[model samples]
Target: SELITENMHMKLYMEGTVNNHHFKCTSEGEGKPYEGTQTMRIKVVEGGPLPFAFDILATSFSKTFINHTQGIPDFFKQSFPEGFTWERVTTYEDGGVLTATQDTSLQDGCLIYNVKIRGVNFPSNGPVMQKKTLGWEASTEMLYPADGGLEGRSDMALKLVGGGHLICNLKTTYRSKKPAKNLKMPGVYYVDRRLERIKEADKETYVEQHEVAVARYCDLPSKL
Candidate 1:
């Protein structure tokens, strides 16, 4: 946090693999000035491997879709200048199956996502299910829901490689922000990543990395 400052340059550089098929991103945007205020100009500067791909979300073929005329989306800039919350609800069968609420708060040129899954209780049964809410932050950057965005190979690997979940025992992280800041962006990041492949709690090493309850067995009354 201390490393970030006003008029600061932010880079969301990620380079790694999943199960096997891994990729990387190291983008440094236009050396723009940062005001570090609630109301400041934000644009997509010169960058590297972005996460937007050929008519698709992501892949190894992903390329940076930077348009000289293109800039931040109006919806993102105008609609949620202060911030926004996108929520979904089941409102039925089993007391609402889900209440996925995604929130984005802008502060000092940062995007914060809230992680509430930690407080959620899943059906107690299979695989020693455990979820969590770890707030995430972002610097200043344009998202890929528009014409001008980013496309990186890491995203490509996820789509073809069957996502970063049980398919590959891998978790993908989406990061593309340049902070002229010193604050945290809080929100819910659904994907989870691990340095090593983790399938189930069956492995002793599984419990070694997470905060979940693993199964244990005891032997009794077998001696003569």
Candidate 2:
């Protein structure tokens, strides 16, 4: 059984503030930039082993944004220019379901960031399921201080032949004896790669793939 019923469409949406300056964006197409706000920087690219593939980045101050745009339909990105925070959502669609959200804010001398991914009405039984190869994958890069104290944690539960949860985690820790004055944050990602092979009358197998649930993060890496 195949989850993707067609070629599928990708959509991305972003909205937030930069020091009281409001901004919003919707993906125009593959390799398209957000047509909003100069306070935050945005970049979009295309690459991946799927029919619809792309990558996006938005930055400004010291915030990390995560969106679901691995292989489904929606993609997102962000950067903190003046130390502001925002919310982003990305989704991939056809018969398969996938979506993710990221929210960030600052108060006092502390920063708070949150992320989540959810999927529904996906094919429960298939070759990937039978082979136990169905899961999520992610990667990320971040900026922070050399001597900053870092604390991180995560929690999640998954089901089989029912629906998927999530997966993939990267860990990095650096220790130096030199004094430094810089700040940094850790970045993580999660991905869903859906591929299938169809046999044709020409005695050949046609390949179709969808890369869903692509995301980035702040201070947390998760897998299940």
Candidate 3:
């Protein structure tokens, strides 16, 4: 029988505020700047089977804000007139199941995983309020050690339910070793923003945001 190993993935979410009053500070701003929230979900899987399932293993979150002085000069701010404040909120969920199969020939080893995500925005209670929703599904597969290392891919499929259907893809590759570490994946995003539009009595606006999540593998105890 082949020994089983476990791994983990991380998820992240961010909220940002954009303002158009850096150049002209007026109590009655015209286009009224906005603030919104975004979210992302990720999962990591390792080779294994029932009783010794895969693990979520670890997770974390990060937050930050952007100010006008970061780049824009007074003259530039006067011409283009824009400012921003951002914050990121990350939450880690503990413990998940991983299912896999093993064969002695080393030719039949594989692991699979699933991930889901959702995001929402809150605006002051008024007639011009806005909200948005976004979601995706991800799956990954890996083969056993082959001297060359383990190879796999992670993909995100569009969630069409809530009148939203935007799709994107990502590629993943990592090494297979005891106490697995150093896993990296690159993402390719093709997002459509028109789907988030909301119309009020006399104006149309969009208030939702989208973001990406980064995850690493961690070891977990096997029940088997």
Candidate 4:
């Protein structure tokens, strides 16, 4: 099948809860292949989109994620790094060096967008820190690689939408680098997604995650 040459827009809002601890991150981005920024607000005892840091990561958690997807069509294709292996290679009193390795991961799921998370800090759980984890992390490369095709679908919860836009929820449990004793541990995250197809010229304002927003594109009454 051929790919669409139009632009696309994606807006993502997420609320993640871990025990009593919770975090909220909103992503606003767009592109034909993908582009944009994701910002987060951690509802802290103090609070900040600043730290983008967490205190109590839940032992058990539920993520309320709403996925609204749309775009120029195509799909899962290409190889991306999935299994990331890091080992402590060097050390200093303040910090150290950890070697990072990314193994090739084929289409694990279907997604038309690449996700980016920006934050810094090391949790006190799994292993000691080399350097404080910071900057933009491309956490979902395998799901939305540059050129797409997944071979076949593997995991992720999917549902029928307006048949125009996207959601692929990912739920997992992993040890925290800096575990919080006062807080919970091994948190779970769910990604809600939506996908769609719209006119190329309208990609900027027309594509939306919310059904009503998109409804305005076709159903709005003409102005005077």
Candidate 5:
């Protein structure tokens, strides 16, 4: 894997619930590695709801790989300093902002990727649009780290206060990288089991889980 340089045009495939309504990409359900009941419900459907896809124009992009550090990396020492110990470290950081609305402050160590939310596409007749009085503000703070494999989560929600709010809490793990669409691009494949929740008055109402093929940054789109 090469260091992530320049801006990225990421394609996010999110399959989950936005409120009670299910917004899913069923393509990921075909292959199941587990025989447990957890993987039983996921049936591959031909066509369904399109993924919540968007374009991110990352600016101020920076990356570095550190090796054989002392006193643990800065990332581990931030919270539970006492429990963690490390010697050699191989991590990357593509730290930047996705437009003005999306930004991150800290650029500590490893592949600490972050993205903040501005807005998303929503249908006019949907529950979220209907419940809230037209004006809705949604944002997310996504953080990813790479020690050996990668992992990430999004702590944000799309909501309209009194009406209805949808929480697509993203949780993902590093899978593997595929061949780049272009030779000059980086090949990084990420997958996630993101949980989506819909709530009203802070009470949880509907919930759904989704699998995502978290492919990112390689072929920069023309518009960005």
Candidate 6:
């Protein structure tokens, strides 16, 4: 393939729980408890082949225990540390588009990645971080076609910054030709977190407290 020059942008509205029971030094003091809705966005400037790159335009960290503590906790740091990992679960057609589900995990924490793609996988993966300016290494395996075929893998890293921004720095190293036959629809990927609570609210009310981004794929020039 001649290096695909495509731009893919996605906005993920993640409404889930983020728990922390650690200590850190901040403008306030130390040993602060924090938890709330964890929302983030992923934007791919160009797509195709290996070493796919993207940006986290923004993330919203709703701190619910801001008044109970002083500084950021050490445990909180580990929750969003550098060198996190994600496992690809399933890829299928949603309406007329292709979507992928991934289970993101850490040594002691967890997250999720539900991505929609517009092309076949050449295989890739790397490290990724979270909204806390943390980083991690991630591995991605691409299963082409709905019923299975060839699969590819890649590794990369994620870098986080202030204001809920992130960048995915990936490095590709392997590709396989083995066809995964007799595949099923609606792929499955699992994480390590258990649902502790479930509350219902108006969609408008939920949107008011969170940030969401809608991503699409297109061909564009690479600059990052």
Error of 6 at 44 (Å): 4.0
Model 1 regions lying over 4 Å from their true place: 1-74, 90-96, 118-121, 128-224
Candidate 6 local distance difference test against the native: 0.22
Selected candidate, larger lDDT, 2 vs 5:
2
Off by over 4 Å in 3: 1-131, 138-147, 160-162, 177-224
* Candidate 6 lDDT, 175-200, residue by residue in tens: 11222232222222111111111221
* Candidate 4 lDDT by residue in tens digits, 41-154: 212222223221121111011111112234312111111212111111211122211211111121322122222222222233312221122111112211221111111111
lDDT of 1 by residue, 95-214 (tens): 212233334454555444432211122233211122211111111122222112221111111122222221111112223233314223322111111111112232121111111111
Cα displacement (Å) at residue 208, model 6: 13
Question: Clashes per prediction?
Answer: 27, 29, 1, 36, 2, 31
Scored against the true structure, residue 164 in model 4 reaches a CA lDDT of 21
- For all candidates in order, the CA lDDT equals 0.23, 0.26, 0.20, 0.22, 0.25, 0.22
Which has the greatest TM-score? 4
Q: What are the per-model C-alpha RMSD values against the true structure?
A: 21.7, 18.6, 23.2, 20.4, 17.6, 21.2
RMSD of 3: 23.2
Q: For residues 61-118, could you state the per-residue lDDT of candidate 3 as single tens digits?
A: 1111101122221111121111111111222111111111111111122111111211
Clashing pairs in 3: 54-98
Cα error, candidate 2, residue 161 (Å): 15
Candidate 2, position 17, lDDT: 30
- TM-score for each model: 0.24, 0.22, 0.21, 0.25, 0.23, 0.18
Q: Order of all candidates by lDDT, from best down to worst?
A: 2, 5, 1, 4, 6, 3
Local lDDT at 195 for model 6: 14
